[PDB]
UniProtKB/Swiss-Prot annotation, chain B:
Zn(2+) 2 binds at K87, D92, D110, E171. It comes from Bos taurus. One of its GO terms (biological process) is proteolysis. The lineage of its organism: Eukaryota, Metazoa, Chordata, Craniata, Vertebrata. This is Cytosol aminopeptidase. Its cofactor is Zn(2+); Mn(2+). Keywords: Acetylation, Aminopeptidase, Cobalt, Cytoplasm, Dipeptidase, Hydrolase, Magnesium, Manganese, Metal-binding, Phosphoprotein, Protease, Zinc. Zn(2+) 3 binds at L7, M8, T10, R108. The keyword Oxidoreductase does not apply. Zofenoprilat inhibits Cys-Gly hydrolysis activity.
Length: 481, 321, 481
C-alpha cells in the first residue's frame, strides 16, 4: 500500500535496529535482516537502502542509518547529536519513499518521536505551489501508537518552521506587506481564539510618529503595514508579555543605495525576521503555552523611485533620535528603530527581535549558527540551551560600546545607519539597535547567514530555511514551563 | 606588546624571515639564559617534509626560516610544554592570487601571528614563569614570480595530507598546516596558535575582540578570564563540523585551502587547521581584526597594534601560578 | 559475488527488457519482472533501481532506464540519441554498483556494446590519486560473450578520453611541460611500436625560430618542451599525414595581464588542447588505423615575473610575422602561431588544431558543442558526422574576413593577439590563427566551453571533461576506413 522508514544503528555483534524494525523483521520472518546482509556494507549515519516487497502492505521499506544508539549532547557541536542523527536520517528515508511516488509513509519513532517527525516534515517540504510540475504529496504518519504527543510536537515544531519557510520563500509580488499580515492572522487565529490581530496601516504608523519605518516605506508604491500579534496565554491576562519584533522588508533592492543584480532574488526573504518570529508565536498558541506573547513586525518594501529615501538623510525615530541614512540598504536597522520603541509600551519581560539584518553576519558564522547579541547572559543561556535541543544553533556576538561609538558619531544627527568603517559589520548594526532599546533583557538575532539552506542542514531541502523558528518556540515552551 | 608592535610595524624589506628570528632570539636571550633558539633553514624544513610551508616560500627569492624558541621555566625540565605557533608571512601580496593595491602596505603585518606569540614567550621568560614554553613560527614571504605557487596545486603537508591550493592568498593556513604538526612532536599541554589569518574575522568582530576557536572550553575560559584583566578581549567562535565539511570535499586532494562558499570565512579557515591538529587542548586565535589601531583602543596610537600579546602573557602567568 | 547493470525500455504492453535481462529474468524465474512491478512506477531514461538478492551470484542488480528502443538520430540534438540513452543509463547503473562498494560489475550490452562501454568507463572515472580517501575500484566487464570488439571499442574510445581527462585534471605542479610529454610518450609507445616521440627542448625551439612560443614560455622558470608525436599507420610510410596541433599551457595565470583569483585553479586545464589531441592519436595507434598522424603540442606555462612577457610587445613567429602582444593572457594564440607553421613542414592532408583558447566560446555555446571554425566544409562535415555518432557535439563558427580585419590592424606589428573590440571573441582569436596557416583543410577547435563537466553530460562525473577526444578518434577511424 504505502511505504515505511525503518532504522538501524551501528555495531555491537550485529548492528541493531530501532525496536519497530526488529519487530517488522520478526513479522516478515527474518527476511529484512537477511536481505540487509545480502545488500552490501552497513548503513552509517543518514545513509539509506530500499528493500522492495518485504511486506504485503509495505512494498517499499527504506532502512536509514541512525548512527550510535547512545549519541548524545556534543561539547563541540553544541547540540544533541542523536536528534540530529534521526532528523537527517528519517528526512533521507522520507525523500526516498517520495521519489518512489508513494503518497503515504509510516515512520519509525527512532527513539525520539519528535526528531523523527521534525525529520519527516522538514525533510519533505518544498513550496510546489507555483510549479505545475510538482513531486508526489506524501502523508507522513507515525508508525505505531505508543509515542503520540511527542511526534505531534515534532509535526508542530517543524510545521511552524515550514510556515516561516513558505512565508519567506514566496515571490515578494505575491507575499506583500498586506498578504503576509493576512496569512499570519489566519494562522494565528486557527491556532488560538485567545488572540487578537492588528494589521495597522500607514495612518496609524504616521500617528505613531514612526518616521524611521515610514522613510523606508516611501520609495515603493506598496503599502506599509505595522503588524501587531497578541497571544493571551497566561491565566491572569495582566501578566507582562514577551515581545517578539522582526524586520519585514517583502523585497529588498537596496533602494537608491541599490543592490547588484547577482542573486538579488533572495531579497524576497528579507522579511525572514518577521516570518521567523510570527511562525514561532503561531506555534506557542498551537502549543497553548501559559504566557502572553506580543508579535511586532514592520512590513514594507525597499525600492528606488522619484520619492525614495536618499543618501544623507535625517529622519526621526519614534523616540526623538535622528538617524543619518547614509546607505538606504541599511533599512532593517531603521524599520527596527521604531518597532523596538513600541515594544517598550507593552511593558515586556524579554524583547526578542529577529532580522535578516547584515551580510557580514553571513561572512562571520554563515549558516552554522544564528548570531544573537544580548545584554542578558540569562537570555543568552536561555537561547543557547534551546539550541542544543532543537539543533538550530545560535552563537553569541558582542554588544560592546566599542561599536556603539562608531555609529554614535554623526555629522548631521544622533545615530547613523552604518558605522565609520567596514569591520565588525554585524556588531555596529546591532549596536545601533541598542540605541533604540532600554529594556534589560533584550536580544537581537541576526538571521542573515541562516536565511538559506543547500546541503548544510540535511533534513532541509535547498531554499529558504526558516531558521531559527524551532529554537525560538523551544525557548517559549521552557519559559512557560 | 610594543615589541610585537615593532616586530609587526617595521617595513617587510627590513623585517625579513631572518631579521625577525634574529631580534626574537636577542630578545628571548636577554630575557633568560634558560633558553635555546633555532633559526632552522630551508634544508631543515625540506628535511622535515614541510611541503605546505615550503610551497608558500618558493614564490619569493627571500629565504624561509622555521623559528624554534625554548623557555625552560619548570624545575624539572621534563615537564611537557605549552607550545605557541604563529604565522609569519613578512609580507603578503597574495601571490598569483594577488591582492589589490588598496592599502596592501599593511601586509607587512601578516607576520603578526609570529610576532604576537614570540613577544608573549619573551615576556614569560622576562617574568621567569615556572613553565616550559616552545615557540614555533614559519617565516617566509608570499610573492608572485616565475616559480610562485599556482592556483589548483596539490602540495603535501608533513602529516601526509594533501591540500588543493585554490587560492594562493589562503597561505597562512598552509604555513600553519606544518608548524601545527610539528607542535605535536613536543608532547604539549596546550597548543596555542595565532595568526592574522582572514579578513572575514575582521568583518565579523573587527578589532573588538580577537576571535579564538578552541576544542577546549577549559582553554576558552582560561583565555577569556585573562581578557577580563588585560582588557584585550577575546571572543569565542565555532569549530563546528559544518565547516570542516566544506573544506574536506576536494576535487584533487584531501583538504582545500578555501571552502566551497564565501560565508563563515574565519570558520572554514579554522576548520581547515583542525585537520592538522589531534591534540585535545588546541586554540586558534585569528588576530586579523586586531591587527591595527586608530582610535578604538585609547592608549594605543594609530598603527600596528600587537594584540593580544598581554592576554596571552596573562594566561601563562595564571597557568604557571 | 559481483553486481549487474541490466536494462529496460519504455512501454508496449509491458515495458520490455534488453534481451540479457529478459534472460536473467527467466533465470531467477520471473522474480526480477515481478519485483519491478512491486517496486513502484516504471523507469524512464537513465533512472535507476536496485534489486538485492535476485541472484545467487548477483546480489545487487541495478535495472536502468534506456528509453525508447527505437530512439535514433535526432534532427535537433544532432546526435544518435540511443547511444546517449545507453551511456547515461549504464553510467548511472555503474555508479550505483560502485556506491554499494561492489568491486566488479557485469554490464548489459544494451543493444550497442560500445555505448554501454563508453557509459560504464566514462561514467565510473575520477582521478582519485591524490586523495587517500577514494571510492571503490570497480572492474567493469561485459555481460555476455557475443558482442566483444564493439565493447572493447567503447572501452578504447572512453579510455582515450579518461587519459585527456587525467592529463587535464592533474594539478599543474605535477603535470608539467616535461611530465605531460613523458606520459604521452609512454602511452603512445604502449599503443604502437610504429611510433616515434620527440620531447624537443628550448634549444630546438630557439633553433626553430619559434619566437612567439618562446616569448610565452619565458615568464615561468619551468622549461618549455615542444612535443612531436609520430604514428606510422599507413602501408606506404610516404603517405602525407594528418597533423594534430594543440595548446599546452600547463598552468595559465594570465601572466602580467593577470587573471582574477576566482576559480583560477581550473587553468591547469589550459593544456586541454594538447591533452585532447594526444589522447586522440594514442587511441588511433591503439586502434591501429591505416593512416600516418603527427601530433604537435607547444607545452609551457604562463606566469608573471621579472622576465615575463609585457604588454605591447612585438615578438616574431617562425613565419616572419610579428605579433603585438597587447594582452599576455591571449598566449594560446601565440603558442599556436608557431606549432601551426611547423605543421606545414610535414606536408599534411588535414591540420586539426585544438585549444582551450577563449572564454568567449564559453559565453557562446558553453559546453553544448565545441566550436570548430574551418576553411573546409568537407572537414566540417567530417567532424560534424563523427559528432552525431559519439554524442560529443561540435558546432561550426565563422572564419570570416570581417574578423581578420580587426586583428590585422596593428600599431607596431603585423598581427595583434587581441582584436580592436570585445565582440566576436572566439572569432578574432580564430581569425588571428588563420594568419599562421596556408593549408586548405584547416580546422580550429576551441575547447574552452567543453573544458569542464558538472551535470550537463550525464555519464561524465564533475571535473575535467576531456572533450572532444572521441569525436576526434571517430573522425580518424572514418578517415582511415
Ligand atoms: Zn538592505
Ligand atoms: Zn534589508
Ligand atoms: Zn594571504
Ligand atoms: Zn596571509
Ligand atoms: Zn590566457
Ligand atoms: Zn590560455
Amino acid at each position: 500500500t504505502k511505504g515505511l522508514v525503518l532504522g538501524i544503528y551501528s555495531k555491537e555483534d550485529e548492528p541493531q535496529f530501532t525496536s519497530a524494525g526488529e519487530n517488522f523483521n520478526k513479522l516478515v520472518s527474518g527476511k529484512l535482516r537477511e536481505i540487509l546482509n545480502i545488500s552490501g556494507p552497513p548503513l552509517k549515519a543518514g545513509k539509506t537502502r530500499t528493500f522492495y516487497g518485504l511486506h504485503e502492505d509495505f512494498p517499499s521499506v527504506v532502512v536509514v542509518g541512525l548512527g550510535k544508539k547512545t549519541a548524545g549532547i556534543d561539547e563541540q557541536e553544541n547540540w544533541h547529536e542523536g536528534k540530529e542523527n534521526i532528523r537527517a536520517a528519517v528526512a533521507a528515508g522520507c525523500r526516498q519513499i517520495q521519489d518512489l511516488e508513494i503518497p503515504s509513509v509510516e515512520v519509525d519513532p527512532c527513539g525520539d518521536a519528535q526528531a523523527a517527525a521534525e525529520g519527516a516534515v522538514l525533510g519533505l517540504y518544498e513550496y510546489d505551489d507555483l510549479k505545475q510540475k510538482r513531486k508526489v504529496v506524501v502523508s507522513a504518519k507515525l508508525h505505531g501508537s505508543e509515542d503520540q504527543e511527542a511526534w505531534q510536537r515534532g509535526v508542530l515544531f517543524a510545521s511552524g518552521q515550514n510556515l516561516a519557510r513558505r512565508l519567506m520563500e514566496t515571490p515578494a509580488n505575491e507575499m506583500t506587506p498586506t498578504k503576509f499580515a493576512e496569512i499570519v492572522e489566519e494562522n494565528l487565529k486557527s491556532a488560538s481564539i485567545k488572540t487578537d490581530v492588528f494589521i495597522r496601516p500607514k495612518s496609524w504608523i504616521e500617528e505613531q510618529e514612526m518616521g524611521s519605518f515610514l522613510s523606508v516605506a516611501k520609495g515603493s508604491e506598496e503599502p506599509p503595514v505595522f503588524l501587531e500579534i497578541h497571544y493571551k496565554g497566561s491565566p491572569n491576562a495582566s501578566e507582562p508579555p514577551l515581545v517578539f519584533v522582526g524586520k519585514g522588508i517583502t523585497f529588498d533592492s537596496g533602494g537608491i543605495s541599490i543592490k547588484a543584480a547577482a542573486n538579488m532574488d533572495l531579497m524576497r526573504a528579507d522579511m525572514g525576521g518577521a516570518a521567523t518570529i510570527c511562525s514561532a508565536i503561531v506555534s506557542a498558541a498551537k502549543l497553548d503555552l501559559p504566557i502572553n506573547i506580543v508579535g511586532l513586525a514592520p512590513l514594507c518594501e525597499n525600492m528606488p523611485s522619484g520619492k525614495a529615501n536618499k543618501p544623507g538623510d535625517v529622519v526621526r525615530a519614534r523616540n526623538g533620535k535622528t538617524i543619518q541614512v547614509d546607505n538606504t540598504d541599511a533599512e532593517g536597522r531603521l524599520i527596527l528603530a521604531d518597532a523596538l520603541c513600541y515594544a517598550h509600551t507593552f511593558n515586556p519581560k524579554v524583547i526578542i527581535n529577529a532580522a535578516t539584518l547584515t551580510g557580514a553576519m553571513d561572512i562571520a558564522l554563515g549558516s552554522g549558527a544564528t548570531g544573537v547579541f544580548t545584554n542578558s547572559s540569562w537570555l543568552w543561556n536561555k537561547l543557547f540551551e534551546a539550541s542544543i535541543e532543537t539543533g538550530d544553533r545560535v552563537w553569541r556576538m558582542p554588544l560592546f560600546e566599542h561599536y556603539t561609538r562608531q555609529v554614535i558619531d554623526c555629522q548631521l544627527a544622533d545615530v547613523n545607519n552604518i558605522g565609520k568603517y567596514r569591520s565588525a559589520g554585524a556588531c555596529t548594526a546591532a549596536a545601533f539597535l541598542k540605541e533604540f532599546v532600554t529594556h534589560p533583557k533584550w536580544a537581537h538575532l541576526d538571521i542573515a547567514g541562516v536565511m538559506t539552506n543547500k546541503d548544510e542542514v540535511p533534513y532541509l531541502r535547498k531554499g529558504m530555511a526558516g531558521r531559527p523558528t524551532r529554537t525560538l518556540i523551544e525557548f517559549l515552551f521552557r519559559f512557560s514551563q
